[PDB]
Amino acid sequence: GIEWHSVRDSEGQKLLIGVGPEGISICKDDFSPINRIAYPVVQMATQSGKNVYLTVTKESGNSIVLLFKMISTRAASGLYRAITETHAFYRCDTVTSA
């Protein structure tokens, strides 16, 4: 079901990002879980060439940025689209009586 994307963190550690129904899943290359990020916590998503940045809200109230380095601009666009468009499936909104 979930589409896993190959990324590298700030240090260079190989990770796997899984975009699912509840949110973002961060794992190691052997799929061992590390952390999970729910979509309401995700404030923003940014793409700068091969890189993808995420603005995450903390339970404290403040916002911090997560960096994900990728092999190509098409790989980054694939992860950016996954976070942005599976949000147009998570966060739905329309009129009823038109």
Residue numbers in the entry: 186 to 283
What does the paper behind this entry write?
The second pathway involves the sterol-regulated inducible degrader of the LDLR (IDOL, also known as MYLIP), which is an E3 ubiquitin ligase that promotes the ubiquitylation and subsequent lysosomal degradation of the LDLR. Two distinct protein domains are present in IDOL: an N-terminal FERM (band 4.1/ezrin/radixin/moesin) and a C-terminal RING domain. In contrast to secreted PCSK9, which interacts with the LDLR extracellularly, IDOL is a 45-kDa cytoplasmic protein that interacts with the intracellular tail of the LDLR via its FERM domain. Here we present two crystal structures of the FERM domain of human IDOL.
We obtained diffracting crystals for two different constructs: IDOL FERM domain, which spans residues 1–344 (FERM344), and the third lobe of the FERM domain, F3ab (residues 183–283). The F3ab subdomain crystallized in space group P212121, with cell dimensions a = 56.37 Å, b = 69.54 Å, c = 74.32 Å, α = β = γ = 90°, with three subunits in the asymmetric unit and a solvent content of 43%. The F3ab conformation is well-conserved between the FERM344 and the three copies in the asymmetric unit of the F3ab crystal structure. Moreover, there are clear differences in the F3c′ region, where the FERM344 crystal structure has an α helix (α7), following the F3ab, which spans residues 279–300 and folds back onto the F3ab. This region has lost helical conformation in all three copies of the F3ab structure, and in one case (F3ab monomer B) even the previous helix α6 is partially unraveled. Because the expression construct used to crystallize F3ab has an incomplete F3c′, helix α7 is unfolded and helix α6 is shorter in all of the three F3ab monomer structures. In fact, in two of the three copies in the asymmetric unit, this unraveled region contacts another F3ab molecule, where it takes on the role of the interacting peptide. The unraveled peptide binds in the F3ab peptide-binding site, making an interaction that closely resembles the β-β association observed in many FERM-substrate peptide complexes. This confirms that the F3ab subunit is intrinsically capable of forming the peptide interaction observed in other FERM receptor interactions.
